[PDB]
Amino acid sequence: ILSQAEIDALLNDIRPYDPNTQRRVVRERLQALEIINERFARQFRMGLFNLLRRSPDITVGAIRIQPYHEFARNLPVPTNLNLIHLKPLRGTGLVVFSPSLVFIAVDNLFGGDGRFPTKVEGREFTHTEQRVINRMLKLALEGYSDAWKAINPLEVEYVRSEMQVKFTNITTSPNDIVVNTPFHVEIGNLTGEFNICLPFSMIEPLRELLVNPPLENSRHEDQNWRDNLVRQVQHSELELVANFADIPLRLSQILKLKPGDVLPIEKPDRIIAHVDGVPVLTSQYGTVNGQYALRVEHLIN
Amino acid sequence: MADKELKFLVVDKFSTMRRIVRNLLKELGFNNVEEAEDGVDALNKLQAGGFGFIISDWNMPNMDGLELLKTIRADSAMSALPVLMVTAEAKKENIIAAAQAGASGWVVKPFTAATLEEKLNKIFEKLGM
Amino acid sequence: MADKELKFLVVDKFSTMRRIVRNLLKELGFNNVEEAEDGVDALNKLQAGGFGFIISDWNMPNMDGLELLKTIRADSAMSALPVLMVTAEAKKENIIAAAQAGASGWVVKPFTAATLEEKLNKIFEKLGM
Amino acid sequence: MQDIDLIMDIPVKLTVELGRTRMTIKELLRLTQGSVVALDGLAGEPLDILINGYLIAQGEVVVVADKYGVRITDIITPSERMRRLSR
Amino acid sequence: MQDIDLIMDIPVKLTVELGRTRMTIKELLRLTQGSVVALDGLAGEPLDILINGYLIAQGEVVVVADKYGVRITDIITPSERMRRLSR
Amino acid sequence: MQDIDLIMDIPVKLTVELGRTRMTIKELLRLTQGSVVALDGLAGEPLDILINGYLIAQGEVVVVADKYGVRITDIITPSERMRRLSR
Amino acid sequence: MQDIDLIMDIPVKLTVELGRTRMTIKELLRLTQGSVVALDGLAGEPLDILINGYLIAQGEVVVVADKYGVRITDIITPSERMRRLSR
Amino acid sequence: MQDIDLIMDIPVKLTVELGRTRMTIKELLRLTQGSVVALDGLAGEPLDILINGYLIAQGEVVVVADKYGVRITDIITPSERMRRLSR
Amino acid sequence: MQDIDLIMDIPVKLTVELGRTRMTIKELLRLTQGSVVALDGLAGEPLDILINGYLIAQGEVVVVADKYGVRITDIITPSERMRRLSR
């Protein structure tokens, strides 16, 4: 069985800005998404072991981030496309089942020895194959929902099934950024793959939650830790800076400044104290014990 | 660039596969696409003329892809017509037989749109289109 | 360094052992790994070609490792193909017979990943890879 | 001086600071209405003059007809620049 | 709502800023035709939206039928505002 | 050059504006999340470069390694100066 | 919580120290390019975490995606603090 | 040399800083056990060497027999001195 | 004296000790508010002057305008160094 390359062999830092790129991309690593995918992977491996009576090997691939059109362009056709909803997040998610994985599951469920792989002829899946895909998708959605519980409880609901990417309509524009997580499934000598693709706008509100690699916290231990940390930080020193007033001028007048020159300024009724440029309070100025003193009036809330 | 008005003949025993191929060609800028259910219908439509490219499946009822390619090559008016072969199993013997018959390209199911676009570009470059 | 795209053929009667060997090879940087259930299937896949290294078990149904190694060495196109022998019992007579047959290495079950890596490195150094 | 006038044609903001001091946040929280905070600068010393937060000169407080004013006293130079840097 | 309508009967100008940066005047004079200036904002970050020079929101650049557009994303909020100030 | 260096030892802020437009406050209130606002500048035209709110040059948007950048194209020039002031 | 938020609207600087050691100025002058200086802290011990020069916690060095990071381990506590002081 | 010896008969403390960064107090409060904080210094860059809080040199981290060590690389130098002060 | 000025550019802390004495912890526990502890130094003797805990000179207490002050009297030298060592 010749691969495409074998068949071909035998037969033979400055970039322009395109506003059609939606550059709101996350250059930070989504560790939390990686942990969720690992948990999802394990929970599903179990489910597949229970369903198929065989031990599956599921490998999580790299979480590649790319525009939607590129993701669509790299999807083998025909393929089983399933639309899912991740409540309460807004949007439609995709669970992509490759025909090879579907055929392997059908073989295992119906007593297939696995010695005769079924070649994809490009035909539509039958009703029995549709029911098998249904069961696999239900198991996958249950595993995904259970995996997401530790970070953010989400309800996964199946919407409809499609065979062509054009009917998915999960993104407003072909250039929209989506998050795709490929999975490789090995069953005996047969290898299958499936993909989970999520639009970035769906997970954009949870960007900070997805960023850091988090877990193992508490409610009372963390409470005491936070209280003691707050107590410790209160001893830190800050530089309190009070500005007398502000004068709008030009650079030419600065060059003409000489000893004795008087610059008119508006008399401030209150003096604003700034910490690293951030105002914290308003006060009146005075002299106490031979030093300039500020009489606090209000604290900036 | 290849002529966007080039006429394509998609031959496959499955209507869904033909629709998928037509949509992929439309996404590539080719809108003149006709469909054939088997080799006999493909040859009958070829006798009408006007086609510039053929995408045919290997195993089809009443005529397989190899016999259709041989018939096309045996016809002087269509001997130079490029034919793209799409199959489910890439057996070496079948590929060698198709190459000896004069196949312009080979695609293995399942495939992506990128692979089809690359094959079409290579075929057009070989033909100088 | 050995070519990371080198194709490996793992032959063993147990699927779990083949999966373990494939995972160990993947951890070593080799991702092109195929599996064979017995000597007959291993020879059939070898007739396809493209393999650069073989890991085969000694006792396998319908063909043992020694007969498979002898058949590989008897073939001119595959006489230079390295073969790694993995066994459960390291009898001196069997080891001598395999060495006379042209075995590139020998591994005894159970083994660690370090031992397999050392054997692969030694075989590659002997072959100049 | 053409480029010089070109850049001069830009409005900029001047800032005069009464003084600087360092305190802990706990002490800041202990401050209420009427609380007293001392500054590190001696009474009568010329006040720092800043342009967009950059210290370039020192001046003295005067009252102009009903408005506060700053009398330019002395500028900087790398010597004072380094001097205040070390200071 | 009455005062809301009264001020509603007024036109105002909205300003969108690509980014901000700080440089010396010497570097500005070194700039010629084709010179390159980098901005402190990362590529793809929402751009500042200003009303009469006052930052009130952030938005993203879109193209509308042949025209540039700004997609409203989030209001300024006090904390982000103070952060930009300290910047 | 002496005064040039003296003013060179000062930090200033540079501002790049995507575009300008005029709208009523009622239209601003009609704007919600996802609303579209058109700008008076044509797509691709060089963007205004401002120093402390003063327009001094024009530039084009570029991406530098992962960051937005402005390519200096041409100075403001004074006839265009008055013209834009009048606009 | 009100005062907590009021002080929360303030930026502060965090400092992580690799280690501490004592040496004479003569030894410092004997240091050249490539010279080696030993630290009093054992290899692998958590590093001191300081806020504006004040030690409040200890952490361990980690690498985050291409950047150094400090893993929070334990707060300073009074006894450990007094111990470091006596040190 | 006499004054050199007179000051040589004095103990001083040396401080090595892993890196520096700026963050808001709100972000500091969001930090818990296991939280990750990035530093402004690139991985592998020589670390700042301070004497009583004064930066005088830079060094690289080494492990000595079971202990952390700093390899002296280069002195601070004064142009870089002002630059870091400005930072 | 270049290296000398280099090292001088470091802030250091000076400590003046009123006196020293030795007592048992039981006696320390017997101390309450108003308790009296005697020092080994005679009244009027110059007080020890320490730099970072290192004794380098002796001085006398004076009052400066409203503030305590130490009048430098005499330094050390290995003779006094050994003398106080033996003392």
Residue numbers in the entry:
A (entry chain A3): 5 to 16, 34 to 322
B (entry chain A5), C (entry chain BB): 1 to 129
D (entry chain A6), E (entry chain Au), F (entry chain Az), G (entry chain A1), H (entry chain A7), I (entry chain BC): 51 to 137
Article passage:
The bacterial flagellar motor is a huge bidirectional rotary nanomachine that drives rotation of the flagellum for bacterial motility. The cytoplasmic C ring of the flagellar motor functions as the switch complex for the rotational direction switching from counterclockwise to clockwise. The basal body is made up of the LP ring, MS ring, C ring, rod and export apparatus. Here, we present two high-resolution cryo-electron microscopy structures of the C ring-containing flagellar basal body–hook complex from Salmonella Typhimurium, which are in the default counterclockwise state and in a constitutively active CheY mutant-induced clockwise state, respectively.
2D classification results showed that the C ring in the CW state (CW-C ring) also possesses a C34 symmetry. The density map of the C ring in the CW state was finally refined to an overall resolution of 5.6 Å with C34 symmetry. The subunits of CheY** and the CW-C ring have clear densities in the density map. There are in all 34 CheY** subunits, which are bound on the outer surface of the middle subring of the C ring and form a CheY** subring structure. The CheY**-bound C ring in the CW state has a height of ~160 Å, which is the same as that of the C ring in the CCW state. However, the upper, middle and bottom subrings of the CW-C ring have diameters of ~446 Å, ~440 Å and ~470 Å, respectively, which are all smaller than those in the CCW-C ring, indicating that the binding of CheY** induces a more compressed structure of the C ring. The inner diameter of the inner subring is also shortened to ~312 Å. CheY** is bound into an open groove between two adjacent protomers on the surface of the middle subring of the C ring and interacts with FliGM, FliMM and the prior FliMM domain. However, in contrast to previous predictions, CheY** has no interactions with FliN and the bottom subring in the structure. As the consequence, the whole FliGCC domain undergoes a rotation by ~180° and a movement by ~8 Å toward the next FliGCC domain and inward contraction by ~10 Å to the center of the C ring, which results in a reversed orientation of the αtorque helix and changes the periodic CCW distribution of the charged residues R281 and D288/D289 to a CW distribution on the upper surface of the CW-C ring.
